[PDB]
Amino acid sequence: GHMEDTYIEVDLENQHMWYYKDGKVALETDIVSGKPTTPTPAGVFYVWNKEEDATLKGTNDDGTPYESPVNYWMPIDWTGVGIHDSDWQPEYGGDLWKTRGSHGCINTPPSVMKELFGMVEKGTPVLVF
Numbered sequence: 001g002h003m004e005d006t007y008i009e010v011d012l013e014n015q016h017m018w019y020y021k022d023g024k025v026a027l028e029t030d031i032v033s034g035k036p037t038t039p040t041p042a043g044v045f046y047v048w049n050k051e052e053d054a055t056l057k058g059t060n061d062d063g064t065p066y067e068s069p070v071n072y073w074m075p076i077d078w079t080g081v082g083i084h085d086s087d088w089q090p091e092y093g094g095d096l097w098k099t100r101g102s103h104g105c106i107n108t109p110p111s112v113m114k115e116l117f118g119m120v121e122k123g124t125p126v127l128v129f
C-alpha cells in the first residue's frame with residue numbers, strides 16, 4: 001500500500017507508464033524501462049521530487065558517467081530508477097527497453113511526464129511493474 005490513491009505507475013512488462021490520480025489515471029503513456037542487462041526492479045519507487053528541465057546524470061552500469069537533460073524528472077530512490085520524460089527517444093511501445101536498452105529507468109513520453117510534474121507532488125509514489 002502507498003499513500004492516498006495517487007502516484008506514478010508503470011508496467012514494463014507491458015511497457016506502459018501511468019500517473020494515477022484518484023486511484024485512476026491522469027496519465028497513460030507508453031514507455032520503455034531499462035535494458036535486460038541491467039533490468040528495472042518494478043514495485044514501489046517514489047517521486048519525492050518532480051522536475052522541469054532536469055538533467056539525468058549519473059554513471060552508466062559500466063562506470064561511464066552521463067547526462068540526459070530531461071524536461072521532466074522524478075528522481076526516485078532506493079532502486080536507482082527514475083521516471084522521466086524523454087524527448088530524445090522517439091519510440092514507446094512494445095518492448096524497446098531490450099532493443100533500445102536505455103539505462104535502467106523508465107523512458108516516458110515528453111508530453112506525459114510533464115502532466116505528471118503537474119499532478120504529482122514531491123512525495124508522490126512512483127511505481128513500475
Ligand SMILES: *C(=O)[C@@H]([C@@H]1NC(C(=O)O)=C(S[C@@H]2CN[C@H](C(=O)Nc3cccc(C(=O)O)c3)C2)[C@@H]1C)[C@@H](C)O
Nearest residue numbers: 056057058059060061062063080081082103104105106
Ligand atoms: C534512467 O535510466 C535513470 C538512471 N540511469 C541509470 C543508469 O545507471 O544509467 C540508473 S541507475 C543509477 C545510475 N547512477 C548510479 C550508478 O549506477 N552509479 C555507478 C554505476 C557504475 C559505476 C559507478 C562508479 O564507478 O562510480 C557508479 C545508479 C538510473 C535508472 C536516469 C537518471 O537516467
